[PDB]
Amino acid sequence: IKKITKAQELIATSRIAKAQARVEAARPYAAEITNMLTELAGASALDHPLLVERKQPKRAGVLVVSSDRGLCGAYNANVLRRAEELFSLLRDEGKDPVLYVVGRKALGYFSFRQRTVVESWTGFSERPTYENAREIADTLVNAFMAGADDEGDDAGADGILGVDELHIVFTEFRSMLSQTAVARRAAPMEVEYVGEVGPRTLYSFEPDPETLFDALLPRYIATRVYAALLEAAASESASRRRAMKSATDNA
Amino acid sequence: DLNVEIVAVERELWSGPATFVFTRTTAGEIGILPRHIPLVAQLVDDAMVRVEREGEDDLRIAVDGGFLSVTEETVRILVENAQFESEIDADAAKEDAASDDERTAAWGRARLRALGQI
Amino acid sequence: ENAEALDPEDLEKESVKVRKPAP
């Protein structure tokens, strides 16, 4: 037991190194796509359905990112407590949570709570790839779009009952010592008008800014979901390292 | 000379000087020389990027989910995925091309275009 | 379980920066 926990601690240290490397590798593309999105938003009309809040919100998708392995000490517990807080806030605002899950631990938790999970993805929590994030973001965005024509409890012309909001509840890797579960509204996105300062030479948009913005917003959402998954993987590795250190101390 | 940077979602793939950059945006085929005007475009689904350098064979990259950003100093291709010509496998590209899934067929066509089989 | 509601301030919202004057 003691030897196993010590070995797991060292392996978790190596995994933390790998996860931090992955986050750093992902950073440049995120920065560049954010810059392009800012340019297109400055050039295009800010009226995308992903960018406009639905009136009378009545459903909110929530993606809870958890781990597959339970050797992490309180990582899943903190994530699920934050998810419960977000559910309470959504109910207070009058919205029904529509639950999506990443990882088996949250699946078991919500199965015990007997809360229906619309869709779940498992098996990649430790080393998530961009394809998993793209699939998750595509499902979430499709659900968000399906909610445009929904009223009350009727799916409308879609035939699919969507959601009016998208939130992500994952563990943010603040540092090696601190990893805090956070809730982030992935959609609808708000517009933060920063002071203009760049404007001396115009960008050329092919074919036109509106279609470029239309195509790039879903990609931005997928990129942010991928970043959240990477942060969750790093946080899970850190918390597993801490849990194994504590177990070795106990043993 | 212009600085090309092919950057994938997961990692930065390639970076370096180049004399010419050819690709296929949604508007149409585009060629970029050093002092091209600032530009933002979306690459076609089966886009291929050719990077002609100085004293070296031009790179041929199959690109999946591409965007192009030309700036006064740098030309950047943001790709969901990309494969250099050497890394591509001809038989798999042929098989994937013209499959039921549109994205798989586009990826196969991009790999074939990079190989030169077009 | 009647869990405490998350503070709306604590919730972080994704935003799209625009280098434009405020409307």
Next chain:
Amino acid sequence: DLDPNAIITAGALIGGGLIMGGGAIGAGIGDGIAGNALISGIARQPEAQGRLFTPFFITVGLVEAAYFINLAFMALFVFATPGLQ
């Protein structure tokens, strides 16, 4: 006194000159515009050329038709002048 045929022939020649001048203006400019479309399309889409020549030679057809129709009537003006005495 002037021969009526002379005045009629001068009028016919001027009329046919107008026929052909207008026809040439229209043909040249319309063909240039259609060719501009074709050249731009081929530049942006090299593999589209084969199909692009279908709507092109349709347009050119129309653009040509008028011209040659005018030409025909020009031949009617000068070679077999209507109303010639």
Next chain:
Amino acid sequence: LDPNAIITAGALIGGGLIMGGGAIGAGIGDGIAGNALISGIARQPEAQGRLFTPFFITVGLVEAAYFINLAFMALFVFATPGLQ
């Protein structure tokens, strides 16, 4: 000077003007409409089927004017008004 000769020369010049203007309009309008059609087909290979409807509408107008001129050009030369 026979008045009929003067009237016929004037009619021929007028018909020349009519048909020259008609040809200019027809050629340039057909060229512009065909430019639109060719560019649309180039961008959208499948749109051809849906594009030939407005195209032939546009032509249907442009060409019509030309032939309307053809209706009157003949009137000028073959049945000259006020020929006396």
Next chain:
Amino acid sequence: DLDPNAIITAGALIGGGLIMGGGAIGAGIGDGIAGNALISGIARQPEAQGRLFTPFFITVGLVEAAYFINLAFMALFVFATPGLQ
């Protein structure tokens, strides 16, 4: 002995020819331009088609009017020539 009516009629025929030349040029080119806009718009997105015929038929209405008014006046020139004596 030149007839005043002959000179006036030749002038009227030339004037009506000018009127129709100008009207046909304007109508043809305006229709071509409006139709180019319509075709490009419909190519951009089919659903706009139904609505796009509203402005288009306005433009044609403005253009065709300029044509047909001219036509009317050309009749006045050729059939009931003002100042014919």
Next chain:
Amino acid sequence: DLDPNAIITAGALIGGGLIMGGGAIGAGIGDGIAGNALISGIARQPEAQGRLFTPFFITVGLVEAAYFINLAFMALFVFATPGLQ
């Protein structure tokens, strides 16, 4: 020994024909261009329907103006011919 009024009327008819031909060309082509702008704008931005009419009506408002002004002067040329005698 021609009748001066005959020559004056022929010149006036030719001048009025030129006036109306130029007016028709300008009106048709300007209306076509303005309608192209309007049609494209409505195609891309359907919500622009109400917004685009006011500039359009200004544009056409100028274009037609010239046309009609020309038309007015054509009448002066044809009916109340200056210098008639």
Next chain:
Amino acid sequence: DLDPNAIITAGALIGGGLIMGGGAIGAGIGDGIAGNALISGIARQPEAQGRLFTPFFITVGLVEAAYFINLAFMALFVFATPGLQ
């Protein structure tokens, strides 16, 4: 013997017709192009509705200028014909 004043007045009338034809063509087409620019700008950038009327009124201001200048000279050609006997 033709009356010399008749010939001069006919020439002046044709000259005025040419002046008006050219002025109308230029004014109509220039106004159409400027209004096309204005409509397109108001379409892409609705916020510019009031900001594009300064350049626009400049463009039109130039265009109309020529037209009206032509008109003035045409008024000289027909009402006070230079070179009259």
Next chain:
Amino acid sequence: DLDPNAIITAGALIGGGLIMGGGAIGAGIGDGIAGNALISGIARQPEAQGRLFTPFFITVGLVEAAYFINLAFMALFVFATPGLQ
């Protein structure tokens, strides 16, 4: 007994009318095109207005120049007729 000066004056008046017609067409259309560019530039980049007037004034400066040059010669055609007998 045709007056040589009368025929020369009619020819001069027609030529001056042609000069004005061409000058007005060129000035109007060129100014319209330059103003289209200026309006599009201002709409696309609000804060460029100032700089955009440096090239615009050049373009107009060229276009108008031709117009006014024509004007001069038209005066030379109508007020001091070359070759007048």
Next chain:
Amino acid sequence: DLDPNAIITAGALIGGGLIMGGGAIGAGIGDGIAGNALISGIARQPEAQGRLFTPFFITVGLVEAAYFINLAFMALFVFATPGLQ
């Protein structure tokens, strides 16, 4: 008693001048438009140059034809005048 051949030759010369003027306008503007397409295509993608000459020249052909065809008839107007007595 004016020579009939003199009037016929003058009319033929005017008609040929109209033919060549219209042909020159059409050819110049159409070639300008085609070359504009070629230059824009090369600017967008320089290496496309080689493949853009085939359509370009085709277009040029379809344009030049009109002009040159007109030229031929102009010769037939002024060298072997139809209807000459």
Next chain:
Amino acid sequence: DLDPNAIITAGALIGGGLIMGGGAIGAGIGDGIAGNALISGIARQPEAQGRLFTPFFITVGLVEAAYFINLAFMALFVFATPGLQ
């Protein structure tokens, strides 16, 4: 009887008027188009101005030449008239 030189001078004046009208149309429209290109380029890129004046001056140089040659030849038509006896 009448002086032939008067007829030749009237024809020369009409021809010079045509020459200058065509030259002015070409100059104005071509300069407007080139200036439109220049203004759009500067609007997109302020620093581009420095270099955009190089091709622009070439384009203008090619257009102005076409204009000025006409002027020169017009001076030949009206001042030293060929065919004048």
Next chain:
Amino acid sequence: DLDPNAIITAGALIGGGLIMGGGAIGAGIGDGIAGNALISGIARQPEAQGRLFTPFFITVGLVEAAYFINLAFMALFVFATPGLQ
């Protein structure tokens, strides 16, 4: 009874004026369009400037040629008039 050579020369001068007017219009507008393409291409793709001169000079070559051909046939008309007696 005017001299036939006088009428022939007047017609030749009018035809040459028409030829030069058409040639000037075509050359000016075609050169302007090609230069607009060149300026826009140099603005967009400054490093390709040299490569853009090869097509441009071709386009100009195809335009100016026609113009000078017109020139060649105008001089003829006014210096060796076909059919002159």
